[PDB]
């Protein structure tokens, strides 16, 4: 069949978010609050195109928005954030319930200096709506032409011509 069409290595180069999973988990709720729109454009493009090769520009916008998010954290509230993700990072399961005072420090400094509000319980799990400008994929499964079905039955059901026609049975 056809040759698979991959993007080049220069199409995949982007400045990475080189932070740990506890760093990402510490500012996860503010990341969901502040980086909503390009992330949801990307995940809508990802569930509609069903192809990661059709989602590279949206992923690059995701990475750019995440980098601007952590640069906006680092300029204003770097030390309460470091105090908070170190305490998140200590735990094996990385509990949020173990670190509520460092969370209160980080959320206080973030609300005072950056105006960000941490979302309530239930908000990040909402199904939102996304205003895209790309067209809707007309055939994302690349489904070919379907086979035409067998013809249905029609007409009034007349009696059997001369019965069963079973050798001599006249009915």
């Amino acid at each position: 069949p056809g040759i698979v069409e991959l993007p080049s290595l220069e199409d995949l180069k982007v400045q990475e978010v080189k932070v740990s999973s506890s760093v990402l988990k510490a500012a996860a709720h503010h990341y969901g609050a502040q980086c909503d729109k390009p992330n949801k454009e990307f995940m809508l493009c990802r569930w509609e195109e069903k192809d990661p090769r059709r989602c590279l520009e949206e992923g690059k916008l995701v990475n750019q928005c995440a980098l601007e998010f952590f640069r906006q954290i680092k300029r204003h509230c770097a030390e309460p954030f470091t105090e908070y993700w170190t305490c998140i990072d200590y735990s094996g399961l990385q509990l949020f319930r173990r670190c509520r005072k460092e969370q209160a420090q980080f959320d206080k400094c973030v609300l005072d200096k950056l105006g960000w509000v941490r979302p309530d319980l239930g908000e990040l799990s909402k199904v939102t709506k996304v205003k895209t400008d790309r067209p809707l994929p007309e055939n994302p499964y690349h489904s070919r032409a379907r086979p035409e079905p067998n013809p249905e039955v029609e007409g009034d059901l007349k009696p059997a011509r001369h019965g069963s026609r079973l050798f001599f049975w006249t009915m």
Binding site: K18, L67, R71, T82
Partner: protein
């Protein structure tokens, strides 16, 4: 009298104290002074292998924070 049973119970209690304190100090020794990462589920393992990739020294416990970005 009855306190004569206490040296044996004390030795048995030290022998029960050694495995737990030992594995706690070993999990803090092999993980950078922290708890061992519990990866019961595949998302926790994906985050853990992402830590192993972003640390650069093939160790998940090397935490990289805001100093690793510009």
């Amino acid at each position: 009298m009855w306190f004569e049973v206490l040296p044996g119970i004390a030795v048995m209690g030290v022998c029960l104290f050694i495995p737990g304190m030992a594995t706690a100090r070993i999990h803090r020794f092999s993980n950078g002074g922290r708890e061992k990462r519990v990866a019961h589920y595949s998302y926790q393992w994906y985050l853990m292998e992402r830590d192993r990739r972003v640390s650069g020294v093939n160790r998940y416990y090397v935490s990289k924070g805001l100093e690793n970005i510009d």
